[PDB]
Design a binder for this molecule. Structure first.
Ligand SMILES: Nc1ncnc2c1ncn2[C@@H]1O[C@H](COP(=O)(O)OP(=O)(O)OP(=O)(O)O)[C@@H](O)[C@H]1O
Ligand SMILES: Nc1ncnc2c1ncn2[C@@H]1O[C@H](COP(=O)(O)OP(=O)(O)OP(=O)(O)O)[C@@H](O)[C@H]1O
Lengths: 311, 311
């Protein structure tokens, strides 16, 4: 098995230009906010499985590895909002995250704000990052709760720490609720999936950078004339499922004697990870499924919005 | 009676490949976690009576027999969470378990964390194992409490000891509560019951290894053409009830003159241990009950989830 090759095949990262555009903007946000005056407050979108958490873990690596190895400073922070977040609920988890506090046996929402606003200059927080903004909409109706939104405006105007919010593409109507939240968050971006399969794409260079990143030491055989056809036939532009199927083929090749990912084990990888796909999506690998041109069609605009049509 | 034969008939263990897969993964977790950097933190599932406690007692035998006979080291630990566990409640029982402390007349949850984090390198804990993770969901509603979850993340990030959590299959939504708990627990497995009765199963080899493991010195007569039919008719794939009925037949055979388990005393064993079964489950042994093919049907996916539908 040689589990080093397995973990080294799973932990692989390809920097598409949108990702480095993002990380450049967050360093821009980090040492552009001067902690004297009003911050910049970027907002990042992206659908399910487009690489968001990988982006922020890249960011806390390249921004906080040496400063977390040096001492208890914690300049950048990483937060997910729990579902249907009460303002005291999000505030207390954001508080027990940073520092070494006890911090949550009292739930009073004024005195823990006191403790968090005295601690946010005490350890020297350079940036606060929130992962999951779509948790503030109701399940069965599309009312949105902005107790946490006005609380986040309060902690923004209290201490001038920059905030970078990630979230689903349907989570922006929450920002359409509070207009002061809408104006305070100026930079919204678009981390949409891979667009086309027609040729000379960013998809190409991503694919062959992943190919040299793979643990097989000669060639992976991928990013070819017909392979990206069935690859884009399998995953829409969907980064998580593409990488998942690729990893599930790579483990199958390293289970036995195999020199590269080839045409006997990539099929069984299509057999496993075909579960999340819809019924009208077509299964292209086993016996005779040639792929029409309309099925490599680019992803629509409401690609991170199908959590929202039904209600 | 000859109670040696009774205890030697009760304490019998058959290593199906999923069990040795597990124990290989926990030795992998034990001396893969280096106690310098971030651990691996496996999670194990399994329904009621699938052999979990037997697996961990096998593990503390084969991992800690000689080191517990040598001195007070206690490298591996065994913990069950009490029901509706307060963080101080789970922490104090995890504390009085290891070492020889007094440890629970104070319930302060900061200073006992102090004592436990100075003691976890003092005795040299190699691994902490928790049995019962399903105790953190509410009875009447499906709110889950994650005071203990964030406390377990705290003790995970404080000292870098690997943690192996066992639990019910419906207990994974608790891990879906905290996303940092979800990401910190990477390896989740599937200890599901025995799948089919159709032939050439793992069930076969398990059955005849149990047959040679039985105290009768010629043959047990089991694992035959028609016996596994009524065996899988009695127990679904359910290891506890299968082993229980087998033991209740073996005691009945050794109560009087009997040379093997046979067709007069195995019936009375079906008479006793038919209580836990549902009403629509069919009782197949007494007079004329031939078993249809649909009743050897494989167990469903929500087989460890019927504690969860009603609320
Ligand atoms: N730039 C990249 N290069 C290689 N693999 C990537 C890249 N970005 C993401 N992946 C893969 O995609 C998978 C999904 O990542 P991630 O969870 O960050 O997406 P996401 O949009 O945050 O999904 P979710 O929002 O549901 O968490 C990861 O397992 C990772 O291996
Ligand atoms: N590999 C095995 N070989 C033989 N017997 C076994 C094996 N595994 C389990 N058993 C039998 O199954 C019974 C139930 O064991 P165990 O309690 O570990 O299951 P469990 O899933 O932990 O149940 P619970 O979770 O309710 O404690 C035991 O009495 C044991 O005799």
């Amino acid at each position: 098995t040689r589990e080093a090759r397995i973990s080294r095949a799973k932990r692989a990262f390809v920097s598409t230009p949108s990702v480095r555009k993002i990380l450049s903007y967050m360093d821009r946000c980090r040492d552009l906010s001067d902690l004297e005056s009003e911050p910049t407050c970027m907002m990042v979108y992206g659908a399910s499985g487009v690489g968001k958490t990988t982006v922020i873990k890249k960011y806390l690596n390249q921004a906080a590895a040496a400063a977390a190895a040096g001492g208890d400073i914690i300049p950048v922070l990483h937060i997910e909002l729990p579902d249907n977040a009460k303002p005291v609920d999000a505030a207390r988890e954001l508080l027990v995250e940073m520092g070494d506090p006890l911090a949550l046996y009292e739930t009073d929402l004024a005195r823990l704000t006191k403790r968090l606003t005295e601690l946010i200059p005490a350890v020297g927080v350079k940036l606060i990052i929130i992962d999951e903004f779509q948790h503030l909409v109701e399940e069965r109706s599309n009312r949105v709760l902005t107790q946490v939104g006005n609380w986040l405006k309060m902690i923004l105007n209290k201490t001038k720490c920059p905030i970078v919010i990630f979230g689903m593409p349907y989570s922006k109507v929450v920002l359409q609720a509070n207009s002061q939240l809408h104006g305070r968050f100026s930079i919204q971006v678009e981390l949409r999936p891979f667009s086309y399969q027609g040729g000379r794409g960013v998809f190409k260079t991503f694919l062959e950078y992943l190919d040299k990143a793979l643990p097989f030491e000669k060639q992976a055989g991928l990013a070819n004339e017909s392979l990206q056809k069935k690859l884009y036939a399998f995953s829409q532009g969907n980064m998580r499922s593409l990488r998942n199927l690729i990893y599930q083929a790579s483990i199958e090749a390293i289970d036995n004697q195999h020199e590269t990912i080839t045409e006997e084990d990539f099929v069984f990888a299509s057999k496993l990870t075909s579960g999340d796909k819809p019924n009208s999506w077509k299964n292209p690998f086993e016996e005779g499924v040639e792929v029409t041109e309309d099925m490599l069609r680019p992803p629509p605009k409401d690609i991170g919005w199908e959590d929202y049509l039904r209600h």
